């Protein structure tokens, strides 16, 4: 039960990354390709707890 | 894999699996290592599907 919002880049290598990303350090956010052309295993389910 | 990141900056490092940093936490037994040379304009279509 801990929401975490952060736009900072996460380093995944020996080099320290501050504003450069793409090869060794990645951006921690990926989007959904929510299209109606899929079947059932990729549709957006509106989940409330 | 700590001696892997000292062979010049890369061009594409997108992956469809586990992280390179967590490779040390899981112990393996069989990995394929094959290499070739293609023109730099033809790297983009090396992708699953």
């Amino acid at each position: 039960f801990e929401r975490d919002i952060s736009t900072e880049i996460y380093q995944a290598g020996n080099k320290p990354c501050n504003g450069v990303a793409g090869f060794n350090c990645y951006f921690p956010l990926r989007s959904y390709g929510f299209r109606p052309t899929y079947g059932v295993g990729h549709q957006p389910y509106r989940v409330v707890v | 894999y700590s001696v892997l990141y000292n062979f010049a900056p890369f061009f594409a490092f997108k992956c469809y699996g586990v992280s390179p940093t967590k490779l040390n936490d899981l112990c393996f037994t069989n990995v394929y290592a094959d290499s070739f040379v293609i023109r730099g304009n033809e790297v983009s279509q090396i992708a699953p599907g």
Epitope: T7, I9, G19, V20, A21, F27 | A12
Partner: antibody, heavy 126, light 109 residues
């Protein structure tokens, strides 16, 4: 799809000018629009984005109070107006549609202007 | 803010000439870079999306990439369609909106 839009002509400064964008072919409920301007012999500049299915809106950090927006979903159009026009605003205006859908601030990264609307040069003189 | 590009760059046909596009910490490097070309007296169109790929109808002739806080584009063959200008585009957080380049002109020799 085709993105015909109606331009304007030479006009007195400080008046109100109406420019409209028409959407055809594709369904006009799922794609954002973006507004850009191009001065002659100059790089492009960004205005903001407006959702078609909502009153969603957002503007740039320099052009805030001189711009409003109007939607006509029944006519399947969007309406764009300029108030307090300047001398160095004689720029061609593009009704740019971006692929996908974004309303959040952090959503704008994956957005490229898939298609553009042909523009007409709007001028201001007396 | 704006992105610094050379106003012009030219090369003879049959070989490859490149265009540079510098960027700051927030302008590029933490984000994705897109490129647009425009025919003179016409509407601009997409050239490279998602920093590597091209849309349908754009051939394999076009290529562009970035390494650090700057991006580069490569063309090969200047016959009838590469005399147009090119633009470098990205997204940042200081202006909270799309920031575009100045403009690059490519001719033939």
């Amino acid at each position: 799809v085709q993105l015909v839009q109606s331009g304007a002509e030479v006009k007195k400064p400080g008046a109100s000018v109406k420019v409209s964008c028409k959407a055809s072919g594709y369904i006009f409920s799922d794609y954002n629009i973006h507004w850009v301007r191009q001065a002659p012999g100059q790089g492009l500049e960004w205005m903001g984005w407006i959702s078609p299915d909502s009153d969603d809106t957002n503007y740039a950090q320099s052009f805030q109070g001189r711009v409003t927006m109007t939607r006509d979903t029944s006519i399947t159009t969007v309406y764009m107006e300029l108030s307090s026009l300047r001398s160095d605003d004689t720029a061609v205006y593009f009704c740019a549609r971006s692929v996908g859908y974004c309303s959040l601030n952090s959503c704008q990264r994956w957005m490229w202007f898939d298609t553009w609307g042909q523009g007409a040069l709007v001028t201001v003189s007396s | 803010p704006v992105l610094t590009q050379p106003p012009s760059a030219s090369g003879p046909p049959g070989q490859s000439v490149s265009i540079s596009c510098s960027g700051s910490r927030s302008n590029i490097g933490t984000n994705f870079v897109y490129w647009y070309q425009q025919l003179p007296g016409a509407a601009p169109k997409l050239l490279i999306y998602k920093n590597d790929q091209r849309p349908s109808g754009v051939p394999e002739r076009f290529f562009g990439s970035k390494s650090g806080t700057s991006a580069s584009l490569a063309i090969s063959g200047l016959r009838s369609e590469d005399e147009v200008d090119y633009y470098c585009a990205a997204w940042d957080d200081s202006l909270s909106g799309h920031v575009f380049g100045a403009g690059t002109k490519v001719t033939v020799l």
